[PDB]
Amino acid sequence: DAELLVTVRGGRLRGIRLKTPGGPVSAFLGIPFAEPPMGPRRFLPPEPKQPWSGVVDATTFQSVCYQYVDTLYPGFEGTEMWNPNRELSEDCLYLNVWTPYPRPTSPTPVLVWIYGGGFYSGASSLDVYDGRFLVQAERTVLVSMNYRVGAFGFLALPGSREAPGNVGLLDQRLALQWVQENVAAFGGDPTSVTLFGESAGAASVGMHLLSPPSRGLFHRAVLQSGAPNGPWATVGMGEARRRATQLAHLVGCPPGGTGGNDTELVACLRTRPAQVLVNHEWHVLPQESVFRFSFVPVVDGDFLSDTPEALINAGDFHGLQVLVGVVKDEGSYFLVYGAPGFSKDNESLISRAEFLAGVRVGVPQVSDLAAEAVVLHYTDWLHPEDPARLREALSDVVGDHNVVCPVAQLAGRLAAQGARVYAYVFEHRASTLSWPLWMGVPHGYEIEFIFGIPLDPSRNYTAEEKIFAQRLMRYWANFARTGDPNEPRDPKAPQWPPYTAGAQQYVSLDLRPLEVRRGLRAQACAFWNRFLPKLLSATDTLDEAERQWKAEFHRWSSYMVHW
Amino acid sequence: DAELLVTVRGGRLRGIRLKTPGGPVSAFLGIPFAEPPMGPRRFLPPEPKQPWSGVVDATTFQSVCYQYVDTLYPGFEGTEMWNPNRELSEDCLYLNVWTPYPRPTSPTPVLVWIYGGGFYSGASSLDVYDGRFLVQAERTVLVSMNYRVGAFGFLALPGSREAPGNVGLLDQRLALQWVQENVAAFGGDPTSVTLFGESAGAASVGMHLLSPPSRGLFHRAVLQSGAPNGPWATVGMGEARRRATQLAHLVGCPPGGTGGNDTELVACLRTRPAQVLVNHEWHVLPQESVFRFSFVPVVDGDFLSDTPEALINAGDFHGLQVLVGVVKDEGSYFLVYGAPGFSKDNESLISRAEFLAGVRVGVPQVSDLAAEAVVLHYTDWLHPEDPARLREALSDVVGDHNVVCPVAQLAGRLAAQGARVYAYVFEHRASTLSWPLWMGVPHGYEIEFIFGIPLDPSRNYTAEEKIFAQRLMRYWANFARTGDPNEPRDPKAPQWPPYTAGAQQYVSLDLRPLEVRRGLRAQACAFWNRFLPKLLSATDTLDEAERQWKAEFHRWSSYMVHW
Ligand SMILES: *[C@@H]1O[C@H](CO[C@H]2O[C@@H](C)[C@@H](O)[C@@H](O)[C@@H]2O)[C@@H](O[C@@H]2O[C@H](CO)[C@@H](O)[C@H](O)[C@H]2NC(C)=O)[C@H](O)[C@H]1NC(C)=O
Ligand SMILES: *[C@@H]1O[C@H](CO[C@H]2O[C@@H](C)[C@@H](O)[C@@H](O)[C@@H]2O)[C@@H](O[C@@H]2O[C@H](CO)[C@@H](O)[C@H](O)[C@H]2NC(C)=O)[C@H](O)[C@H]1NC(C)=O
Ligand SMILES: Nc1c2c(nc3cc(Cl)ccc13)C[C@H]1C=C(CCO)C[C@@H]2C1
Ligand SMILES: Nc1c2c(nc3cc(Cl)ccc13)C[C@H]1C=C(CCO)C[C@@H]2C1
Ligand SMILES: [Cl-]
Numbered sequence A, B: 001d002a003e004l005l006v007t008v009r010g011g012r013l014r015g016i017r018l019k020t021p022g023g024p025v026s027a028f029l030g031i032p033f034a035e036p037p038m039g040p041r042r043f044l045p046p047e048p049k050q051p052w053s054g055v056v057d058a059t060t061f062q063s064v065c066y067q068y069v070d071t072l073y074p075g076f077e078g079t080e081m082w083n084p085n086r087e088l089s090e091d092c093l094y095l096n097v098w099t100p101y102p103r104p105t106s107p108t109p110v111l112v113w114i115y116g117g118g119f120y121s122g123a124s125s126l127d128v129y130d131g132r133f134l135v136q137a138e139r140t141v142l143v144s145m146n147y148r149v150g151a152f153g154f155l156a157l158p159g160s161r162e163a164p165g166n167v168g169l170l171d172q173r174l175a176l177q178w179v180q181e182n183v184a185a186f187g188g189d190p191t192s193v194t195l196f197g198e199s200a201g202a203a204s205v206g207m208h209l210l211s212p213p214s215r216g217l218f219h220r221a222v223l224q225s226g227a228p229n230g231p232w233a234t235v236g237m238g239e240a241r242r243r244a245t246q247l248a249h250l251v252g253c254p255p256g257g258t259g260g261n262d263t264e265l266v267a268c269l270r271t272r273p274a275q276v277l278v279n280h281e282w283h284v285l286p287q288e289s290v291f292r293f294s295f296v297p298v299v300d301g302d303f304l305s306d307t308p309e310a311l312i313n314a315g316d317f318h319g320l321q322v323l324v325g326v327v328k329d330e331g332s333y334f335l336v337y338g339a340p341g342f343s344k345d346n347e348s349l350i351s352r353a354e355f356l357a358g359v360r361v362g363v364p365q366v367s368d369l370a371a372e373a374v375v376l377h378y379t380d381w382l383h384p385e386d387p388a389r390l391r392e393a394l395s396d397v398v399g400d401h402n403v404v405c406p407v408a409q410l411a412g413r414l415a416a417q418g419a420r421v422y423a424y425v426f427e428h429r430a431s432t433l434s435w436p437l438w439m440g441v442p443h444g445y446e447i448e449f450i451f452g453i454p455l456d457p458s459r460n461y462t463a464e465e466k467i468f469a470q471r472l473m474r475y476w477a478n479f480a481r482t483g484d485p486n487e488p489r490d491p492k493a494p495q496w497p498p499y500t501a502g503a504q505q506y507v508s509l510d511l512r513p514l515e516v517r518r519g520l521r522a523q524a525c526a527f528w529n530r531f532l533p534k535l536l537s538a539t540d541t542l543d544e545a546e547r548q549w550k551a552e553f554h555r556w557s558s559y560m561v562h563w
């Protein structure tokens, strides 16, 4: 075996060798890094794993954190890709290391993966998150970790010691602390740790940039199709107390006061089986919406000092290099979750009537006048009725609101405040794809290429896609290594320039070589980031004034019934 | 002379022969068609000209209606083009006929010209409104007429018999009635009368379509860079009483009541010299604005049954053919009248700060939130600071708001309700032009080509422009004759298709042959015509609610000063 035996601070580990077409890899999977967050420890921040006698079995992925299983489309190929492979447990706090073969002699750059899934789902075990190709190809160390999701990770009762919220992000931190201690045992270099995440994963990465307690734990960030300042990534304190109290209520838990609240609430909440908690998860979502999740990070003053957008503007970002991007059709897949017209089984050619309706679903909690504004902008007024154009439109609406425009605002604010930033649009549809053509390149389908999954011989990927992934892994590795993706020096391949606030350049990642484009959905984002709030603000002080007018006409009307 | 002697219902006339490069023309200019609207008759609708002993001298243009003379740029070539050539009088109600040589044997189509100039200026005598080329080339009869402008034509005290408003439009009507009676005396055919106007002229034409008393007086309409439903073309009853009462006040005229009001007001108003009235004309304009005029037609219930936009939607338009259009850079010239940054003497390269400011001037009387919306839409968010782009932007703002979007709404509403409509964009800059390049093809510079003025040898026009005008006159004549501009049949020249509500096709009139384009500033107009009102409506019921909140905090604050 040569070296599948490794000793980290807690104890000894036994790993497994993994085959790749290029060579081999040493993987150590399921390394416990926190005390199992069960019983009294549910909802509580992670305590570090006590050290162990014996040799820990690190030959296999540990069980997936307890979560909802998305089963809209039973037995569908492209839907079980993201579904939990290992069994479900609350005892799920484990991490995974892929290091080259043989273990490198000098300390080498580390990549740490944080998965997405709305903070309601996800696992480091998923076959698309296998680090063996990326490690074999770029000869760097890759670490991924499980973190608590759903209520188990994000249920907050802001200001209580028994459920303070954000523990899911604490899990992520604890693993990074583990990384500083134990990553050298694998040839890793705790002075060159680059965070990369996608979706909520990307939103997490962003929150670690914003929380000072984490800043000493990494040196670079990559945000894929997500941002800590997106509308679905954070919830207020008031709002999360409501959601957790509703969940408590559904599940049968009295609040009140003599000792607790809220200690007696959370105490009762821990007696509940995990499934009972997950059964009632989606009830607590306020509105009609798509791309919204019940339990997400809270702005509590603790982990996040202020709201992500606030911290973003204020922050100094010198000495940071961050790589940001999005897929071509971010919004597309979500519309099958209740936008009238959409299914994965027809070309979702919506009628204008269906367009207008879904605008209210894709953009939740907005006054009438606001959705008028979304329509105005996202309508081709030369083809208002055209069904294909209306389909792409509601898909850009959902994409721009949730992903492309939060990311674009961030990347501007960073770049202009000290960070060297590089932006990309990943616009290549996988040939192995199993979803309808109208979805295009949907949310999360760049991931399988970054991890060089095309190289897997069992998988039916094309030759130029294999090459594509290798180009992509190199881009990413050159980042983690140097904080610049475009090679050490300049080959014959076109150069990827930093995204800045003015020129706003970015690159297009598809089979064709790097094309530089100026403008990241610039015109759309002006609406979302600059104009819309000045509007919503007014409709807010107008829905307060139409409310005072019905109260003042109710008493007026009664003075008439007397007459 | 063969036939420069003609007898119309009122009496005999003596005309003059006019030379053109093609041949000759018989013109009869300054034919009195109403009793001079002076003394007791000021502000009163026109009475028809009593018949006369003798031979009336119709060899020369009669004096121009009393008006303000625009003298921003003293001694400027392109500014005195529109200035009054004949002397000024209130005795100005005269009309002009150009008929072919020799007088035609069969009754031939008639074109009636109504000049523009904001209802504050204009004259049928202006050298650019000479009918000799158009009549010689297309062998049709052309009639133009003076009509009262400014207070003398549009000062209203809605509902009084002594100043009922709209008399300027009554002047235009009276001439058309004259046309039914006397146009056959010249070879004209009172069953084929086509109205054509530009600017306020076009807005007038539009109002005759909307007033049933006029409908029996013409058969086709051409609207050039103007529409009866534009924001500057009509004023409310309340608003025009205010303007006329302010004017009365400035000029020293007591209102009140014992006999009149408002008879004693208007009585006093008639004692005033005409200049005293014109001195005080622009004081009565409410806001800060550009492209707004003091005295314009009033929606009184009389001439206009309801507001032009209202009448437009409701109306039946079958059996009507109307030809509509605009120049390339409608908005451009107006910005030198107070938009900060603009002069005809520099390239008006405004700063973004100047852009934001002029939006409030080009679009008057709009809430803060509304101008935010104008900015959002008219800003290239990839080049927000670019001065040339901001210059063109505020020019499209003024153009789209005042001209292109009112016209586009009209042409859609007509087409879709029975009229056969043809739309054009006149995008050719005159080579004789004397205004700065940044103005492009400005408001009113198609006129000189429609009247075939390039053919004038004294004028320094180019060969292909001469040809251009001839192509244009033919387009216009084929309309007046047949109600279809694109020839009787189909040559080798590309065919001009009717503008419709859906496809919205139009043509581009410049030196190059007809190019058909789909979409008449479609995306801009959605903002102006569909969205903006839903907004202004809300900011209206929000500025009423922020007003009730300061009244309710004034009494609240005093209950604190007591405490
Ligand atoms: C595209 O699909 C939707 C819904 O799903 C349809 O397509 C298949 C998945 C299959 O299950 C099929 O039987 C199913 O109806 C269609 O919209 C639905 O239309 C029905 C009436 O047919 C309504 O009563 C439903 O409310 C509505 N559901 C949704 C989710 O909108 C839609 O008609 C179809 N598009 C077309 C016209 O091809
Ligand atoms: C373009 O012109 C304007 C105003 O007119 C200027 O240009 C000539 C016509 C000449 O009369 C010249 O002397 C005159 O100033 C300029 O804007 C003006 O700037 C001055 C200060 O220089 C301000 O005090 C004025 O308020 C302001 N007036 C207007 C009408 O805006 C402008 O600077 C110029 N553009 C450039 C920078 O070339
Ligand atoms: N369950 C899915 C996921 C992702 N993408 C998906 C795409 C499709 Cl088409 C269908 C299903 C998908 C990417 C990640 C994001 C989410 C939700 C957004 O945080 C869940 C999971 C991981
Ligand atoms: N005084 C002018 C006029 C017109 N165009 C002008 C263009 C320039 Cl660049 C400068 C001056 C102009 C066209 C018509 C419209 C108006 C005002 C709009 O009803 C007045 C007059 C006739
Ligand atoms: Cl394997």
Ligand SMILES: [Cl-]
Pocket: A053, A054, A055
């Ligand atoms: Cl031991």
Ligand SMILES: [Cl-]
Pocket: A103, A104, A105, A106, A139
């Ligand atoms: Cl090595």
Ligand SMILES: [Cl-]
Pocket: A236, A237, A238, A239
């Ligand atoms: Cl809050």
Ligand SMILES: [Cl-]
Pocket: A313
């Ligand atoms: Cl700021």
Ligand SMILES: [Cl-]
Pocket: A209, A315, A316, A317
């Ligand atoms: Cl910072």
Ligand SMILES: [Cl-]
Pocket: none
């Ligand atoms: Cl609509």
Ligand SMILES: [Cl-]
Pocket: A481, A482, A483
């Ligand atoms: Cl470095």
Ligand SMILES: [Cl-]
Pocket: A521, A522, A523, A524
């Ligand atoms: Cl865009």
Ligand SMILES: [Cl-]
Pocket: A530, A531, B372, B373, B375, B376
């Ligand atoms: Cl804005």
Ligand SMILES: [Cl-]
Pocket: B018, B019
């Ligand atoms: Cl002459």
Ligand SMILES: [Cl-]
Pocket: B053, B054, B055
């Ligand atoms: Cl006589």
Ligand SMILES: [Cl-]
Pocket: B103, B104, B105, B106, B139
């Ligand atoms: Cl003839």
Ligand SMILES: [Cl-]
Pocket: B236, B237, B238, B239
């Ligand atoms: Cl009114």
Ligand SMILES: [Cl-]
Pocket: B313
């Ligand atoms: Cl209607």
Ligand SMILES: [Cl-]
Pocket: B209, B315, B316, B317
């Ligand atoms: Cl009608």
Ligand SMILES: [Cl-]
Pocket: none
């Ligand atoms: Cl701004």
